[PDB]
Amino acid sequence: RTKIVVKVHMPCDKSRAKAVALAASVNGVDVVEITGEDKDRLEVVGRGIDPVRLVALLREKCGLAELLMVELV
Template identity: 50%
Template sequence: MKQKIVMKVYMSCQKCRNKALKVASSANGVSFVGIEGEDKQKVVVIGDGVDPVKLTICLRKKVGQTDILSVAAA
């Protein structure tokens, strides 16, 4: 089942955004990764069988503070 995960990642620069995209795209089952929102703080991940908790932990370790905003079927 495809799911859409929206996370708020506190990123201050373009280098941080690129790193967050790279980390999110390296997770198993990810088919789309993007950044949205007015302040470019939301990372959207769409994929099949993606574990949102593991992805959040990985983003916290490599980028910074990360919060899960929503997990829904895509």
């Protein structure tokens, strides 16, 4: 249903993993993937996602989260 693209502070490859894993646990999330040429963005797909609570949770635990694009399909 919804495709979210959020930019996350993920310095090393271990913070990538735990960020990819946090979004995975949000309700409604079917899939998370790393993306962007700087490998600094997550793409989150699912149905019924709350984009605000998602990005907030990323920002609390990572230090930065910015919602870039919300797409419907």
